[PDB]
Every structure is written in C-alpha cells, then in structure tokens.
C-alpha cells in the first residue's frame, strides 16, 4: 500500500514522535491552537499552518504522493516556526534541532 | 503537555 | 477592600506580571486533568488552586483578610508539590514563584 520511499518516510516521521526527541519535538506534536495558546497573531502571519499531527493524517490517508509532497510539509512546518517565532526563542532551537534529526534520515533514502 | 504561549512542560 | 488587601492585589499583580513569566506560567490557569490526561488529579488534589482563581475570589471581594489569600496562594503550591516527584521542573518553578510571593508577603503592616 506504501511505496518503499514512502515506507521510510513513515519511519522517519515515527522517530520524530517518539520518546527519544520528546524534549524539543513536543511544539510541533499538534496544530497551533492560536486560542488555545493565547497567539492571536499566528494565522495573520502563518497562513499556511502545519504540525507533525497534521502531517501524520496525510500520511496515513494516504494523501502524499512521493516523498517530495512529504518533505514540503515538515520542511513548511519549520519554515512557519522559523517565519513567527524571534531568532533568539528556545523553540525556534528546538525546531532547528528536530529538522537536524529531520533531514539526516531523509538525506539517507535510495 | 502544559502549553501557553510557546513554553511547554511535560507533566506527564 | 482593606489596605491590606491593597498590597495583597499589588502581590498577585507582581506575581502576574511580565517580571516572572518564565516561572509563573503553570500557574496562570488552572490545572486541566482531561488536557493533560491525569485521571488521578482529582483523586490526590480535592482542592484545586492557580491565579485565575484567586484574581476571581480577590475581584469578587471573597477574601475576608490577608490570611485566607494567603492560604489559597500557599494551597496552590501546595496542590504542585503533593502531586508532582520532587525532581520535576514544575517544583523548581514553584519555589522560584513562591520565593517571591513570600518575600513580597512578609513585608506587610
């Protein structure tokens, strides 16, 4: 039902949930609840929002097509972190040490 | 999770 | 409300403010058992405490005198303290918090 690419892609978004990356991955586990989080500006600037939850509801739909389509997503999913939060905030830090576990294993696919 | 505005907390 | 509890509004502000956002933020709220899927809080904790409340009981004029402020905002700590292991973050935050409600506290007329 999975392709092979996309079997390891379902891989690399397993260990990106899991316990290992639990203390830096845990900003991204669900969609921005801009109410829910008191950030009422976060659809002004994000208009495009995007979180590991969304992206592992894709996946199991079946909905990307090639591990491009899934790249686009976690890679957008730390642009809109990147694009919101200051340089200087510990989150963006996380986001750059969870893409650094991203793009490792992604970088390792025949 | 405790959340607020993009702090975090694992209580659990 | 009183003079006292004048400074006592002027605590809770203190505690509320931008100063000790870093700290202070587990306790902005109160504490959701279901959002955090703790079955047991309510088992352990019949007396559940946090800011909102005690902002709610202080506006409301619910508080007789200093001392049952007081209570709430140590019951609050206290709630953080029996239910949490002593090495987790939440207790170095609380400290951190109550250290400066007490200091605030102790200098009252």
Known sequence: ?110 | WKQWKKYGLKIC
């Not at chain 1, 991204?28 to 002004?44: C, N, R």
């Open chain 1, 1 to 110: 039902k999975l392709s092979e690419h996309l079997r390891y892609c379902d891989s690399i978004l397993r260990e990106m949930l899991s316990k290992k990356h639990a203390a830096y991955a845990w900003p991204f586990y669900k969609p921005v609840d801009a109410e829910a989080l008191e950030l009422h500006d976060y659809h002004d600037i994000i208009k495009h929002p995007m979180d590991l939850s969304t992206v592992k509801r894709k996946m199991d739909g079946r909905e990307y097509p090639d591990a491009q389509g899934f790249a686009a997503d976690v890679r957008l999913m730390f642009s809109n972190c990147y694009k919101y939060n200051p340089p200087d905030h510990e989150v963006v830090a996380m986001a750059r040490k969870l893409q650094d576990v991203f793009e490792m294993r992604f970088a390792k696919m025949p």
